[PDB]
Design a protein around this nucleic acid. Structure first.
Length: 234
RNA sequence: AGCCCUAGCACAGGUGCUGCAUGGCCGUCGUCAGCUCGUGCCGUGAGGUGUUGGGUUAAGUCCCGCAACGAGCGCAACCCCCGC
């Protein structure tokens, strides 16, 4: 069930803010805007999903990254609808790269789940009370989907590679293959498996992402509903 | 044997010089909000980033941001005096 779904309103997006590297994956410039060829979207989408399968079934790990308004919450869903880690709030420099050291923050996060419910729940010099228990805040805020990552991922799934270029560059440095939902800002050449689509339309992001998580579960049996994600659409 | 007295021998002694050979301890900028490290990222490189920025503080005090994430010597606190 694809075909026209994307053609809902999730074809073409950005306008003359382009990157001529994307000249291939475009149909026409109607009414001032760029409109992306969907035949080609599919051509790529298969190969891309086919990648997902082959490493999904092998029991891989995809690191999901979306931070635009229009993604964000739709990432902490489908990622968690998959047990797959995600970055949602802000991409920290060296997440893949300085990983060992960024991890030390998770090493130190879950020292607080301990003292969440412990003899240290309503005691200790109680200015420390809030500050320690408001330190977990920064921690829970940024490392929500990141705590699961215990080893470097086998892939990264991105929704805007020119927004998330800092992550991508980290990937490729580590040869971690880059998967991305990407439109006419983004430089294809450094996106390994490409889903030429729409970095912005909240509909588009979901239509694609959710369905890609579907294969991640289909490759381990037990698919469900249209999935807990239909946004505050209006 | 110990120890004392005279003639000898090693050695004692020196507030004699060198703070520009030094230890130690002090003074000083200055109780000023600073000075750095680890890993990553940038740069052929010295280096940079971090520590720049906005709000806030007695304070690099916190906050919000951010290719950085943290850490040490600082600041503050743990000590003493005075107030109930």
């Amino acid at each position: 069930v694809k075909e026209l779904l994307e053609a809902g309103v999730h074809f073409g997006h950005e306008r003359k803010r382009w990157n001529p590297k994307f000249a291939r994956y475009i149909y026409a410039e109607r009414n001032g805007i760029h409109i992306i060829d969907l035949q080609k979207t599919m051509e790529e989408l298969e190969r891309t999903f086919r990648f997902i399968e082959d490493l999904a079934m092998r029991g891989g790990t995809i690191l999901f990254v979306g931070t635009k308004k229009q993604a964000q919450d739709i990432v902490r869903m489908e990622a968690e609808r998959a047990g797959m880690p995600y970055v949602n709030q802000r991409w920290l420099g060296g997440m893949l790269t300085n990983f060992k050291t960024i991890s030390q923050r998770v090493h130190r996060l879950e020292e607080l789940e301990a003292l969440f419910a412990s003899p240290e729940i309503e005691e200790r010099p109680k200015k420390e009370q809030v500050r320690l228990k408001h330190e977990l805040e920064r921690l829970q805020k940024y490392l929500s989907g990141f705590r699961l990552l215990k080893r470097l991922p086998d892939a990264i799934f991105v929704v805007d590679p020119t927004k998330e270029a800092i992550a991508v560059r980290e990937a490729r440095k580590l040869f971690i293959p880059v998967i991305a939902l990407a439109d006419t800002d983004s430089d294809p050449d450094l996106v390994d498996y490409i889903i030429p689509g729409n970095d912005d339309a909240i509909r588009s992001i979901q239509l694609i992402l959710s369905r890609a998580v579907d294969l991640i579960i289909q490759a381990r049996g037990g698919v469900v509903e249209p999935s807990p994600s239909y946004a505050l659409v209006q």
